[model samples]
Each structure stands twice: as structure tokens, then as C-alpha cells.
Target: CCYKLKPGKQCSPSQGPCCTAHCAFKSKTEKCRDDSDCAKEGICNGITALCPASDPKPNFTDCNRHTQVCINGQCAGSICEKHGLEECTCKELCHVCCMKKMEPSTCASTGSVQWNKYFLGRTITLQPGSPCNDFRGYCDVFMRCR
Candidate 1:
């Protein structure tokens, strides 16, 4: 009586579950069933083997404000204009934003997507999430890319 699976779903019998919250049960789509709980960056779609929840390849920046908005190619979080008076040039450019900061979460607790949620842009975890700019005078959060 044990079969949970969530890190990527679609488990055939990866040893009868027990990975629990740490989540594990991958069979195909190697290189990383590295599912971040699939808030919008999940993979393992080897032709729809199931392990979905993807599309955060956008929203250029927001470590304070570098966001411009792209959408299908990547970049669309802050969407520009958020920092008042452009303090130190938006903290010298969101500390140099490259994107992919970590802490990306917002959905995927179950399953019902057919694609249209378009999920992406995650900067609501507390600045530890990335895109710098904690918003409180450029929170930065101590990584001090300054």
C-alpha cells in the first residue's frame, strides 16, 4: 500500500514508491527527472511519456528590473518599469541577471493541464528565488553580486 510518485509522475514500478516528498520514480527521459515539483519547469517529455509542467523560458529579469517581456522565446517577468527613479540603475542591472535563479514554484499539485497556462517567471519565494531585486531597496539577499 505505497505508491505516491510526484517528482515527474508516470511510474511503472520504480520499486513501488517511497520517495515521498523528495519524489523519485523515473524510468525514461534521463539527464534529470529534475522536477522542481513542476511549477512550470518540469521536463521528461520524451514524446509524451508524461512528466510535464514546462515553460519558464521567459521573463528576462527582475532582480530589481531588467524584464522586457518575450513570451515564447523567454523573458517576460517584471515586464519593465518597477524600480522608482532607477536606483543605481536598478541595482546595477538586477545584479547582472542571467535568469534561472531557483525557487520557481506556483502550481502543479495535481494534473489537468493540456498547455495554455504557459507557466513561467518565478520570483515570489522571498528573493532567494532569483532575478535578484527583493524589491526592498534591491533586496539582493546577500549574494552580493554588487
Candidate 2:
């Protein structure tokens, strides 16, 4: 002879009967672990416990966004003039303004560089290298080659 328990009743573990729990109760959902775990409308934020929308891209600037403070790779602030520096045309390698007086020699030898007004105070040398004449033709290839 088996007996059935009424619905929404908490049966003792020792009891040989199973009961249905309340429908109003629900299990707590776990937080997202990564971008894939988040909902379509959400993204994994820097804060591990929370998820938010992706950050908007910044405006373009003429500075090294990776090394210097430039919004969207554009130069910001009062430019590099305060430090006696001027903008250089070598955007591919030197995006930011180069020190007017400090040449590549100073950086290569001492691993340090400085800015000065007018002429350079110290004598430093740089190795002569060929300019990339085929910059436009090879730009896309080089960027995607690797």
C-alpha cells in the first residue's frame, strides 16, 4: 500500500514519497562568464560580475593611441610643442610629433629620448635606411601578410 503526498508539501528525505514544489519558486540564474554567455543585447564588461553594452569608439587623433593619450588615434591637448617637439610625416612608424632636437640616435643608444628647442644639444647618430618607395603598393600586403 503506497500513499501519495499532497502538492506543495516538503517531504522528509526518509519518506518514500516525492512531492511537487511550489510553482512560484524559481532557481537563481548564474552570472555570465564571458561574451558568449551574455545575452545578444549585452557584452562581457571589464567587471567580471557585470555585463554591459560595448564601448563606443573614440574620435581620431594624430598621436599614438597605443603609447600616448590620443582619442581615436588623433593628436590631443596642446600638441607636442610645449615639449619642443614637432609633428613628423612618418605616420606609419612615428605617428606622434617627434622631438625637434632629439634624433633617432639618442633613442637607439641610450634607449631614452628628449625634446629640445632649435638644434640638438647632444651628438647622436642613426643608421641610414632606405625609404619604402612602394609604401602604397605594399601597405595592404604588409598589414595582412602576417
Candidate 3:
């Protein structure tokens, strides 16, 4: 948002509520309604227009990016290898049959997990697999940043 000054209402040279959409003089001049009303080389600072050498930093990160610093620190990634199998719940009909074939069905149930490795500071997929009751299931390979 931007501000404009009222008619004949003087403001400090450096700072003051000069003009804006909510100002009394808003209808008087359309050149000072908001920041876009000013030229690309200028900034509408509420009361006065300032043509600074460069755009003002909006925040600390902006200043850091403008200047030079170890700003964001370092980049890092993580990996976890968990070994486990997820059990599926059988429905009523399947549940009753499963109870009778629990041992055999349990041996037939399968599950899988993933393994990620990094190289040249870049994460790479080394191997992918999961706990499987049979070899019918296979790992799907993919890459991700996070």
C-alpha cells in the first residue's frame, strides 16, 4: 500500500504521511496514489516520493541477498533405514479365512522399504527394496531433493 498527502498539508522532508488512497488529496492528483504511481526510479514513501539509487531492502534476508554473506548457512540432507513390515487387516470374510490360514497367509504377505545414498554431496539412490514374503513385489526407483 502507498500514502499521499493532503492539499497544502506539508510533511517532513525525510518522513511523514503525505498522500495515499485514504488521503484527502487522493482525488486531487493521481500521480501519488501508490508506489506504482511513481516512476520506476522513484518510490512513493507515503508523504513524499524518493528516487533512491536502488530499491530498499524489504527484510534482513533481502539485505543479505543484496550484499554477500554465508546467509543461509549450509545445505544438509538426511537418510533413514527402517526395517519393518506393515500388516494388512483382512475384511470380515477374509478375516475368517485368514484366521484359518494365518500362518500360511502371514508367510505370503509382503512389504518393502527404500534406501538412499549420496555421492558428490548429491543424494543418489543406492538400492531400494522392502520386506517381501515373495519376490513378486519390486522397488520403484525415484529421486527427490528433500
Candidate 4:
């Protein structure tokens, strides 16, 4: 007439005689034995045999070579950046600006391309609000470091 009890599920009398008189739930044994016993998003707590919500992995840990990363303990896709403009050609306007490693204040762009394949497929983009030139305080959408 009632469902049996599992490890950590609550057992109350309001739910009828679902649990035994002396046994509300297992008290001595933990819910998990190892981290592998838990799901990807959970870390096992051996004391309770429970898998608590947690990120066992650190953020920004590389999942793949500049392609995937571990963000907030979850595996996510990502992109990389180049040091400076390698081969640049300007179209209507330069949209991709690569900043220098030694001096990030200035930048250059790779023309007419979406920065899809250059310097090991790394992105050559200057941050929008970055310093571009003395005349302009911040870089514009045109990818100029001004």
C-alpha cells in the first residue's frame, strides 16, 4: 500500500506507513562512495553518499586546444587571440584588429576577412572599448585602436 524508502528521501508519517517504525532512512551509510559515483554537474560527498551541486573542475581549464574550455566548472566552447596583425588588408573598413603583445595600446586589422583562419585560426580582434590612438579615447567598431 506504500512505496519503500531509498537512501536520502524524506520519510514522514503524513505520507502514511511508507517507512518502518525504527527505520526512517539509512543513517549510518553515505549516499556516495566516490566522485565518479555522481553526475557531471555534481561532486560526491562521501559522508552523506550524496552528490551536491558543485564544479569539481576550475574555470578556464582547457578542454581542447583553444577551442573548448571549462567555464564555471562546465565544458564550453571558446576562441583564442593572436598577438598582432599578421597579414592585414583593408576593405570598406577594418573589422578585425589585433593588438600587440608588447604594446596593447595600438592595433591593426586583417582586411576583408572574418578572422576565420589566421595565426592558427586565432581571432585578431581588438576589444571595442580598448585604447586605439591619442585622438580617439577608445577603439571604434571599425576595429581601429583609437
Candidate 5:
């Protein structure tokens, strides 16, 4: 069978010269050149030129009022800051942390916590080492204010 074929002909690859030598049903795979090559919710890989279905959004991109961030190419369902806790742009951390008012705005716990019914009614967890303290500091992995 041939490597690539023209339109609209029906025959088995073993019997015909229009399909893979192995008699595979599907046609040849095409390399993607750009994001448009993939349908919605996908991105073209720069190196492989392959389109992975359901590819992740650009990592760390701001979404949902900057309250959420894309992590590992997907928007995570965790809350970094809900109120007075500000996002640090100067020194950004992939993991997000907030300040504690009682401690005079010291970066709070980077603990692994999970809870729903917060601002957006989705379960939320904390990101350790998330930039906080207004670009002055960040939460530590120890899960204590720092």
C-alpha cells in the first residue's frame, strides 16, 4: 500500500495501494503548525508539532478575576487570595499564599488545606510558597506564618 492516498476510494490496504502497508484503517497523521490546527481547547506543541486533545491552558495564566491561576497547564480549583490578601506581581510564585491580618500582614500558612463553600462555592486548597506580604515575602512549605 502507498503512504498517502487521494480522495474517495475503498479497498483494503493489503489488496490496494492507497493505504498503510500494515492495512491500518486510519489515514496518515498530519503535523500541526499552529494553535488553529487543533480545535478549541487545544494548543499545538512547538517542538513535536502534535496537537494533544484537551491540552492545558498556558501555565500560570490569570483567570477568574485573578483569583485562580493555570498550573501545569490547567486552571486549578484553589483560592489564593479572597479578600485583603493581595497578589504579588513583583516576585511571583506558582503557588499562591496570603497575608495574615492578625500578624500584621505576615504571609500565612502554605498548608495543604481543602474546603468548599468559600467565595466561589468550589473546594479550595492552599498553595505553599505562594508569594505574599506584598512582594516582600512568601509562605513557606512548613505551613507556618513567615
Candidate 6:
């Protein structure tokens, strides 16, 4: 996004106080003194120049859908990887162990077992509810060590 000052914000080769990103004291003539300065929109030729007319590279970045990881490559598309279906753009499995062994109840080895690992959610019965009606609130819990 370049400008000599948007024809609206702005100025002219003849208009005074030319508005610009970097204030232009005067016609800040950008010339294509070399091929490098020139090969864009058009090309550099003496007083005229076009900086860069290339399309920007595309990328997958739909945060709403799911994950995205980047890598070096000249291109992209669906089903892209060394193996598999769908676009498995991630080159390696980025993983970590989600579970660790419990360090036994602190009192267990001391022969004074003090375990209190409470889990949420318990249920009671009402008139004609599931499982409850099926078993008539009748179930047993024998302390069986597995």
C-alpha cells in the first residue's frame, strides 16, 4: 500500500503540502536507479518506477476451525505431507505425557493409609428415574482391592 498521498488525503505534483506516510518535503522522487528498485507494478525507467508487483504467499490460518503450524515450503494444499490424508501440515507429533503415576497416599507406606481422592458427581433416586428405577436404588459397593 503506497501513495503519493491518496488523491483524497493528500496532494499532487502541483498540489501544496503533499500528505504522505513520511512527510514529503517536496516530490520525494523514488527512482529505479537500478533493476532492484524497479521490478514491481511496472519497472524503473529514469523518472518512472513500480516497486513490486508480486502476489503475496498464501497461508492456512483459520483460528476458528483448528490448529496450524508453519514450515518452510514453496506451496500448500489439502492432503499435504510425507504420508496420510487431509492436510497434516504439522511435520512432527508435538506431544507430552498427560498423565503421571500417583505418588501413593502419603500415609500408605507408613501403614496408616490416609487416602482421600474425592471424585465429583453422585446421584440419588426420584420417582421413576433411570438406572434407579431399573435397580430400585439397590446396588452394593464391596471394598474390593484391585
Best-matching candidate per TM-score: 4
Candidate 2, 11-117: lDDT as tens digits: 43223112113312112232222222111223433223233343333432223222222443333432333344533323143223344455633321111244433
What is the lDDT, from 0 to 100, of the residue 57 in candidate 4?
63
TM-score of each: 0.21, 0.20, 0.14, 0.28, 0.27, 0.16
Candidate with top lDDT is 5
Question: What is candidate 1's lDDT per residue for 1-146, written digit by digit as tens?
Answer: 22354445544433432222233444334332342211244545344334554555433333323334444434434432232112112233343222222322322211113111222333222133343444444334653332
Instruction: Write one digit per residue (lDDT tens) for candidate 6, span 8-123.
Output: 43323333223234433323444322321112222322221223233222343211112221223222322112112222101011110011124212212111122112111111
**Candidate 4 residue pairs that clash:** 30-49, 31-48, 31-49, 32-49, 89-111, 132-145, 132-146, 133-145, 133-146
lDDT of 3 by residue, 1-146 (tens): 32264455444333423343343222222332233211122334433433233232222221211111122321111111011222222211111011112344542111111211111222222123321223334333331111
Report backbone clashes per prediction. 11, 6, 10, 9, 0, 0
Rank all candidate structures by their lDDT, best first, as comma-separated numbers: 5, 4, 1, 2, 3, 6
| Superior by lDDT: candidate 1 or candidate 5 | 5
User: CA lDDT, every prediction?
Assistant: 0.33, 0.29, 0.25, 0.39, 0.40, 0.23
Error of 5 at 55 (Å): 5.5
Ranking by TM-score: 4, 5, 1, 2, 6, 3
Worst ten in a row by lDDT for model 3: 91-100
**Model 3 ranges off by over 4 Å:** 1-7, 14-42, 45-67, 70-146
Sliding window of 10 residues with minimal summed lDDT for model 2: 124-133
